[PDB]
Symmetry: D2
Subunit: 120 residues, 4 copies
């Protein structure tokens, strides 16, 4: 139920393929009408989840460099896919920027994102 | 400088290859070195970091399923590589386990790992 | 304003008073976990926030010991109060349990709670 | 003896002086290595005053809002962690620093990190 297009609550979209070997591969678009706002993602998911009501654990990374832009940073999302008629991917994320050592204390933001199969 | 064998502070073993386009691939886990303890990882890194002394942002995921065990969970590490005399990767991580909706509040552990090219 | 009774998305009850000196005091009752009736909280908030439409930063702690139960753990909530037609406190939290050194890597849970003055029960 | 009352130093110079009350309160101040009044802020928190006896640490947490009589950063840090006793006593923490932001900037409101405190520097 993971392969396809997902939308967060803030205007981002990604398309992912959940491969038979546990791979997640796809593209994350940070801004809707922008073609220079697309980035590679890559991650892993549990390809044999429990069928007991529990979500399917997964995670992925986007390094915020493409052919057009580079923020010198990367986000990782860690979360779980929850199926059903209102399917969701519920995540928490860490965004680390490259810094000098003196700035390392402020290198990492934390937050949370919920993705749905239908636009907000 | 990222490609290589790294060890965290607890002795976990991170064997990674960084490709020219931003891909990370490799295997994660073990001090025991047994086959039941090794897992696929994939991730991303900034392939054109700043030239001002800042580190190189990266992240990767392991889903904790292999041919031997399945913990129904996934860890993502978000961090930066710091070159120089003693290379290091400093990270923070999120470990999400699949849960029911009622237990989702306790699904995610957080911590920090530092990796070097020598065993602890 | 921050002073009042708030509820998170799970129905936990946060009764707080914001003092003129930046202090938060009050009680917390959890909808989840190894917890029963009210626990003491204390924290701090920015008593002179920016005037540009930003929220008001704050944080508080509950140690999960009262006269009835002790879970040997503590949650801290870090967040901001956002004035609006529907005022909200948006937080991230860290729950640390006391552990042995061997188990310290799994000592800390992380999550996010949103509080409103209206209960979403 | 809880072992927590006193002065602690993190790995980056900062100092705090805390009192651990018999009732689970933490009260004190957080300051820089320099120690000037302008670098000193109130803190408040809670700790488990009856920790387990199996070798586990003592859970605790505290908050500093970064406003004092001199300066205001419109932000607050919470530290969540555990005290570990012995000759080399430590407090191992993870922290969340939330800044007041507009809603448009709320996605970047919160930094995360970790701090280890010891009794010597």
């Amino acid at each position: 139920g993971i392969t396809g297009t997902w939308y967060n609550q803030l205007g981002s979209t990604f398309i992912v393929t959940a491969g038979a070997d546990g791979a997640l591969t796809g593209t994350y678009e940070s801004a809707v009408g922008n073609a220079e706002s697309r980035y590679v993602l890559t991650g892993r998911y549990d390809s044999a989840p429990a069928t007991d009501g529990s979500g399917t654990a997964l995670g992925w990374t986007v390094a915020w460099k493409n052919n057009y832009r580079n923020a010198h940073s990367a986000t990782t999302w860690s979360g779980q896919y929850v199926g059903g008629a209102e399917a969701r991917i519920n995540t928490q994320w860490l965004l680390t920027s490259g810094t000098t050592e003196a700035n390392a204390w402020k290198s990492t933001l934390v937050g949370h994102d919920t993705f749905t199969k239908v636009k907000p």
